[PDB]
């Protein structure tokens, strides 16, 4: 659905956010490309507690669910684009994979729940903003 | 059954104990290994065996799969001397061409396990609920043991043995002594033994196990086989509704071998089937390969049962952290926290260039940082910008910090290299000169790869240390 719905909050890539999310913003982080806004309905997903390095993500440019293995949530360079200057982003998981700009908002899951959301990509590597420590979403 | 129950209880009681620490780690392993063999020795081996040659059942797998809409065109089953069985092309296949798919109804999955004869026990036991791979392994055994089950044509083509560590001789394991990989081997063996002992008791006593096909015979060999069959073959697919993800064994996919490349596999939810496309052009007669994933050599040997030589993704583990005894601990901790970096963690030194990740570099830049430098990175709005250049190799804090950083790393990598029992020339000599078993070869090749990575790390750190010092002088 391009976003993660847990409890009464919706998590989105900050640069995909709309005015409605800003009005209902409870938390944001520039450095993680995340925006959290409230919802009126209860959600369905769960933020996984697990210390996994493996999972599946919906790659919308392929319309397929790919398994990936990922490096932990370190500090990674992100290339300059129409939303951000070249910068490093924190808490970003990395894996070899397929990612085009239209894949932003695709969700990464393991058998324990949601792990993160597609925030960066290109040239064979796909990177996810880790959401595992936003404990307060529950 | 009395002998098995008496020893089973002993095993569970011994293997449930916490580790004794490194001085006795080898000792713990051989004690469990001895006890496990005492138990295995009294059992008949696999409960269900088949009389034909493994390859004699391929025609039934192919027939069965074709009846259910799977792809059975353009390739066939052959025995490769080097790897063992796998697919060979019969018609030329082009890269990115879809050549293989498997419909969901043929998959063995946890979701389907829930509805099998195992269902009533799955729903009650905590481990079966918590461990996807265990529930899948027990589902596999239940189906193996059921003569009219749907998956007999697939189960009948699985090998009777695997080359993962659970099948290693004691003297083959011995070659890994003091390597990092052995820590993961010891754990794997120990946990497998514990799971068997626990479940054996559950099947014998729990009332929902009364109708299971595993009620009459569950040998160590059966469990070991099932676990190995899952861990060497499993993949992850979305659940039927796309709401979660789950483990699966995929017939007629797990016959592909491993090579280097991109991931060519994935699940097509819209058509409810697993798909795979060609990684590279294959002419008829060529072996078909897929990329298993960006795994390390230790993982390939321990979980997949093989040592891949040109592993461009290999690495070794290094543990680092900021001492709590430091004077600047709190300040360093704050800088790292702002950067999203933990005070202590396990990092890795990589085979390929560059040897270190940005996170480790940033970590170390703080690790060696002094008080004044920390204040620059903490006080003032510009501090945040300084913090987010820490992982940028073109932005050294000071010539002094780079020299201290590379000096530190040069020494840590050398110290780790000094803990190995043998050196590089000696291992190369052994591999070339001895007519070693395959399992012994893996243990040695893995041991050697860890040393080669560390040696490279030392040399590179030494060079950077000299480079930055020279810049300091100008
Ligand atoms: N390039 C490679 N080099 C060495 N072993 C490989 C390999 N690719 C795959 N394997 C082998 O294939 C197994 C994965 S399943 C592939 C089919 C397998 N030969 C069979 O008999 O059913 C591994 O356990 C390993 O034994
Ligand atoms: Zn998980």
Residue numbers in the entry:
A (entry chain B): 4 to 141
B (entry chain A): 22 to 495
Publication excerpt:
SETD3 is a selective actin histidine methyltransferase that catalyses mono-methylation of actin at histidine 73 (actin H73me) to regulate actin function. Through unbiased genetic screens, we have previously identified SETD3 as critically important for the replication of a broad range of enteroviruses, including genetically diverse rhinoviruses, coxsackieviruses, poliovirus, and the non-polio enteroviruses EV-D68 and EV-A71, which are associated with severe neuropathogenesis.
We determined the SETD3-CV-B3 2A complex structure to 3.5 Å resolution by cryo-electron microscopy (cryo-EM) and observed clear density for residues 22-495 of SETD3 and 4-141 of 2A protease. CV-B3 2A binds in the pocket formed by the SET domain and the RSB domain of SETD3, forming two separate interaction interfaces with SETD3. The interaction surface areas with the SET domain and the RSB domain, including the linker, are 747 Å2 and 460 Å2, respectively. The linker region connecting the SET domain and the RSB domain contributes two hydrogen bonds/salt bridge contacts between SETD3 R336 and 2A E74. Additionally, a pair of main-chain main-chain hydrogen bonds between SETD3 Y288 and 2A H68 form part of an anti-parallel intermolecular β-sheet structure between the two proteins. Although we do not observe any overlap of actin and 2A binding in the SETD3 active site, actin peptide residues 66-72 and 2A partially overlap in the substrate binding region, forming intermolecular β-sheets with SETD3 involving SETD3 residue Y288. Compared to the high-affinity binding between WT SETD3 and 2A (KD = 47 nM), a single mutation of Y288P in the SET domain (SET288) reduces binding affinity 53-fold (KD = 2.5 µM) and a double mutation in the same domain, SET257+266, 213-fold (KD = 10 µM). In addition, the presence of an actin substrate peptide inhibits the binding of SETD3 to 2A in vitro.
